[PDB]
Design a binder for this molecule. Structure first.
Ligand SMILES: NC(=O)C1=CN([C@@H]2O[C@H](COP(=O)(O)OP(=O)(O)OC[C@H]3O[C@@H](n4cnc5c(N)ncnc54)[C@H](O)[C@@H]3O)[C@@H](O)[C@H]2O)C=CC1
Ligand SMILES: NC(=O)C1=CN([C@@H]2O[C@H](COP(=O)(O)OP(=O)(O)OC[C@H]3O[C@@H](n4cnc5c(N)ncnc54)[C@H](O)[C@@H]3O)[C@@H](O)[C@H]2O)C=CC1
Ligand SMILES: NC(=O)C1=CN([C@@H]2O[C@H](COP(=O)(O)OP(=O)(O)OC[C@H]3O[C@@H](n4cnc5c(N)ncnc54)[C@H](O)[C@@H]3O)[C@@H](O)[C@H]2O)C=CC1
Ligand SMILES: NC(=O)C1=CN([C@@H]2O[C@H](COP(=O)(O)OP(=O)(O)OC[C@H]3O[C@@H](n4cnc5c(N)ncnc54)[C@H](O)[C@@H]3O)[C@@H](O)[C@H]2O)C=CC1
Ligand SMILES: C[C@@H](Nc1nc(-c2cc(C(=O)O)ccc2Cl)cnc1N)c1ccccc1
Ligand SMILES: C[C@@H](Nc1nc(-c2cc(C(=O)O)ccc2Cl)cnc1N)c1ccccc1
Ligand SMILES: C[C@@H](Nc1nc(-c2cc(C(=O)O)ccc2Cl)cnc1N)c1ccccc1
Lengths: 331, 331, 331, 331
């Protein structure tokens, strides 16, 4: 018969659902960085890609497939239709609209809502029990949107939030101190971006509180002006975009780290965006980054960080701002 | 009194020469895909990037650095000046000229020669003992060019050659047979590109020769048209390019596999481009792909594959054409 | 409020179940080598250990647990009671008597069959959908036994078989040829023991057939005496046993290689113990190694190897021997 | 000619001095667990094993070699003679004599000193520039002994010290809090074993000080008796030994973590034993664990942990006791 039949004797036809499937939505520079990082970390037995640009999507899929000999992820699929995402444990959303020349923040956000109004229901239809990880900006608002639209419980809706901000901060800290970032601990929480909060009290190496050692740490009287470190962090995306036109590698690595905790049920703690209603005097339905325990069911727990008055007020202001935009959104 | 001094006591300041450093020249889609794959495989204790476009170059470096928390490569550097590449064990070249429409092969190769006359002597100045891995196309000729300009012994100048072609072949084979590419064995040799040779006699699973089971394999009488697999291999770059505009991931993965053998001294066998004078019947100084043993000295040995009359003729034809061009090059 | 409660706000409780649980029965030298290999390969989110020596069991569990900071497997349990193994995707059996210096694995049948009569029903009780991977000796005989007792379909009952014999063969081959064993291909089939069969016709590097190059290969008139390489494979366990009293590391690695194909659904080809009825005119329900495609459903396919008349006779000899033993077993 | 020569053409006949070599001295339970952990983390291009029991040594080497197909460490060698250890970057000492019943501290140590008088000079002879990592107990004293005998600068003599104590502590903390050990930070310092010191002020999750939330942490009036955690850490070794007769896996993993930072020049911070004269009122040549920065040159820096009065006196008391023994040793 066929060469395949002469070579191989089959015992079983009945295939099986993929058991550790991940989907990435949006195959732009960010989506694809998440994809490559996920593949090279062996987190999935099946990866699906979705996008609206069909030729691009197919080309990315094929380029990855051609690398299969060097990977341990035996099936890569893609498509415009969401049936290819069926039974994903985790669905990472990087799709969205880039802010345009002259466009306001409310209109920018609405355009992204209008995109999530199509994306989310489709994801939910095919993977009703997945965790949602939102990367698209503005991430805090869009994570809220996906939670609202999906109707998922809060543990299954997760925003990339200040995960990368924190990684950047630890890299900068590491360079200043001559220590690997892995051994430099420090947390950036709150609203992702300009209004994020560097938690000076938790910055440490080997458990040694930097703020205890240098009480001026984080202030203007800070002889070393560590404030600037948080400054470089907030301005990193812009600096990199000005140099290469976009960002990709760091976000991809940082998302892959989140995926690892989730897929392997590690219960590590990560700074990610989560519904914070009921904390720091916040009573609105808003998402902000706090250290969260990540595992098989998403965010099972969050760490209640002790904040100072100034630090609590900043999150409160962020929450207020976020809510004021959200009550204007049309679903 | 500085925070760093309060926190850390320095035992010594000394030495600090990288032990496992890799340089990538050219930070386009291919260079960066090589970079990310090499990082995620923990192959290097230092990565250097070089390019002539300084904006892009700086942005790519920073983007990778921001992901340092998630990597085990503590030092990433870049610059237009080759002093950043000093003491590299392995230098990977992806830079070169893009062919114009209506431009003769000889004309293009000449432009590349002129480019390499700048790049290669600078690489050699700073890492006189490195292995050179050439990825730029046309790879076989450009590997000859690098060998000529560098003055390196044959073992230390390696062309990526048919390495990715063979990986693509194994993927396609795997797809047809329902087996992982790791367990599908097949070799594409000779001149990288449209003139490459699929060695039917060597294709096997678990040491069972497909050609033996199926004597028409690869001929025009093949009812299953396995010849189309090689045709797909040859058309892959073009098909992917047409879809996404370039290729990156598969080449990056393949290059990292080669780097792995070299850096870890594995002595695995890969199909890569090497000085083939004296073998398979060729009398000129030309590089073509054959299976090569790769390790810490680059190519220390090569495998002598038995070819059919036709297969031998095709390699001989390529050598003729390549030499016809090389002999008219101006160094 | 407790410290934990001050520090951590819980979103939801209710334990979930492991997604990728592996059980190892027998925490002896082989069981623990399997355990550490599987842990360091990140194949499981839960590892369960079972043995009849309760203090040794607890101690091995604790020793592993103490290394958790350095692993990615968040839960490790043990117990004499099989409830600790509930919900396992893969159950690896390494319990029972091992052969002493100069003793045949075949001398272990009565002891180990009697042990399997208690083990197997318990495993099936708590993980009715697992794949069974048998390691205890003699492994081909015990795979048949595990199969008969369990009532599983044979795809889900796998003996570690000649995966290790082939690994040893390829190590010895690579040493002779100066090539990494990954690049040296050659298969040892049949009994994991004295009657195993080296398949000279399939041995190759880069698709180049050593038999075609060297027609005496494997015969008695072979001036290079390659048969001695297979003889060394046969005597391997005995040599190691005489030196250090037992074998552990290589089987540990071999088992983990098998577990990776199964757990990640790779569909790689390995020589494992399975029922070969219907091949080479064999009519009995005899188990022994041939190349198999391994995935999430265990053995989905067998590769039909083309044996020479002499190879096939040697394989049928092995089968006769093994069936002579298997057929006399009383269940 | 030979099959090898018919198959393979040679370009050059090597051979390089070892580039990333590690030696393990002593192939007992701890030695081999270090070895397998190092092999599975791909830290070395060459592994050497030394012991005085020749059959045992050879057998361990062979067992490992048989697993070569599954590893990326292409050369594994062993011998009683230290010439096999030449050009090691890192030499790990696990050799020693186990303490006899009713034997004084001094006499046990002196017995290990007699062993080191032979081992260390041999190591130094063949790898004059290596880093020494001392694992044999009592580790702080034997690290001093290796330091004095070797004549090395202090940066190149490292004791595993409280590395494993700290890993256990973090495993126990993770169990109490329902969080992965990776995200549970806490440091055990000073003398390894009975007199080690838990630094309560450094224990934290996500930079949130447990001592600050819970002032009674680690005190006698602690309602949650967190001191019992440190008590478990000290009793752990004894409990495991009592159960399985020895300990191996955890120390093995902890050592490979240190080797990783050293071989890869990561500059992470580990609690390891270092020459601490000049700290905490310590004025004698003694080794005690504090957080050290580990890289290609061994310990290049250490972190100055702020200790309480009692914490300080505990270290000082250990240093007095240690020197009390050291000043009596016959070298
Ligand atoms: N949370 C964080 O820390 C960071 C977030 N980001 C965000 O990642 C997002 C995307 O990044 P880029 O890849 O550079 O943008 P991109 O525009 O290059 O790629 C976006 C992709 O979304 C796709 N898309 C648009 N509408 C879609 C729909 N209805 N269905 C499916 N696909 C659709 C587009 O076709 C496009 O391929 C941005 O919003 C960016 O802000 C970037 C860096 C950091
Ligand atoms: N051998 C193989 O199997 C394959 C080879 N390739 C080759 O990779 C090469 C590059 O691919 P792309 O990254 O997509 O092209 P690219 O043009 O986008 O990237 C090339 C980079 O080289 C830089 N460059 C140019 N001149 C330089 C100089 N004198 N010094 C340093 N840098 C210089 C450019 O600035 C550019 O950033 C192409 O030649 C392509 O054909 C691509 C796929 C497969
Ligand atoms: N398939 C292969 O290539 C290899 C197979 N083996 C086999 O694996 C087996 C194990 O060898 P070792 O681990 O070195 O022996 P071991 O003596 O070190 O450990 C055996 C363990 O089995 C346990 N055990 C006995 N009865 C049990 C029961 N009813 N339930 C649960 N546990 C039970 C023992 O308590 C003991 O801890 C032997 O049969 C050996 O021959 C060994 C090497 C290679
Ligand atoms: N720092 C730490 O946290 C820990 C340290 N250890 C220590 O590791 C050491 C070893 O433990 P085990 O492997 O269980 O002991 P073991 O007795 O089983 O093995 C020790 C090996 O040292 C060898 N040896 C003796 N003299 C030698 C010489 N002159 N040259 C080369 N080798 C020689 C012995 O032959 C023996 O094989 C012990 O001192 C133990 O306390 C163990 C656990 C933790
Ligand atoms: C499409 C979008 N892609 C990206 N956008 C960002 C981005 C991130 C933040 C942020 O992290 O807060 C803020 C603004 C932007 Cl533009 C980062 N990386 C990207 N590939 C983009 C917008 C403007 C210019 C270039 C690219
Ligand atoms: C710059 C070059 N970059 C690449 N070029 C190729 C390429 C490879 C081959 C080949 O390997 O035979 C032949 C032609 C091209 Cl165009 C593959 N991947 C690339 N990123 C490119 C040229 C034209 C169009 C798009 C890109
Ligand atoms: C040979 C030695 N090997 C080991 N010894 C210990 C050990 C460690 C400590 C400690 O860590 O302080 C204290 C006592 C012992 Cl016995 C741990 N693991 C070992 N393989 C041993 C001595 C007595 C009993 C059992 C084993």
């Amino acid at each position: 018969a066929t060469l395949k039949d002469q070579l191989i004797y089959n015992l079983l036809k009945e295939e099986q659902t993929p058991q550790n499937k991940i989907t990435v939505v949006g195959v732009g520079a960010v989506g694809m960085a998440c994809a490559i990082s996920i593949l090279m970390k062996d987190l999935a037995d099946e990866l699906a890609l979705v996008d609206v640009i069909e030729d691009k999507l197919k080309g990315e899929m094929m380029d990855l497939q051609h690398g299969s000999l060097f990977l341990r992820t035996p099936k890569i699929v893609s498509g415009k239709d969401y049936n290819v995402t069926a039974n994903s444990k985790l669905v990472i959303i990087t799709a969205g609209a880039r802010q345009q020349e002259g466009e306001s923040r409310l209109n920018l956000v609405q355009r992204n809502v209008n995109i999530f109004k199509f994306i989310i229901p489709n994801v939910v239809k095919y993977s009703p029990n997945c965790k949602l990880l939102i990367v698209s900006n503005p991430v805090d608002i869009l994570t809220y949107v996906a939670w609202k639209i999906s109707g998922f419980p809060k543990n299954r809706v997760i925003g990339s939030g200040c995960n990368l901000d924190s990684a950047r901060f630890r890299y900068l800290m590491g360079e200043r101190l001559g220590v690997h970032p892995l051994s430099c601990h420090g947390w950036v929480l709150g609203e992702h971006g300009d209004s994020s909060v560097p938690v000076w009290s938790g910055m440490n190496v080997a458990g040694v509180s930097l703020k205890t050692l240098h009480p001026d740490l984080g202030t203007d009287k800070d002889k070393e002006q560590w404030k600037e470190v948080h400054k470089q962090v907030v301005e990193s995306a812009y600096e990199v975009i000005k140099l290469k036109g976009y960002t990709s590698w760091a976000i991809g690595l940082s998302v892959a780290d989140l995926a690892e905790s989730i897929m392997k049920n590690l219960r590590r703690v990560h700074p990610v965006s989560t519904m914070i209603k009921g904390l720091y005097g916040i009573k609105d339905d808003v998402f902000l980054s706090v250290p969260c325990i990540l595992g098989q069911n998403g965010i099972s727990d969050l760490v209640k960080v002790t904040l100072t008055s100034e630090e609590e007020a900043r999150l409160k202001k962020s929450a207020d701002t976020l809510w004021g935009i959200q009550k204007e959104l049309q679903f």
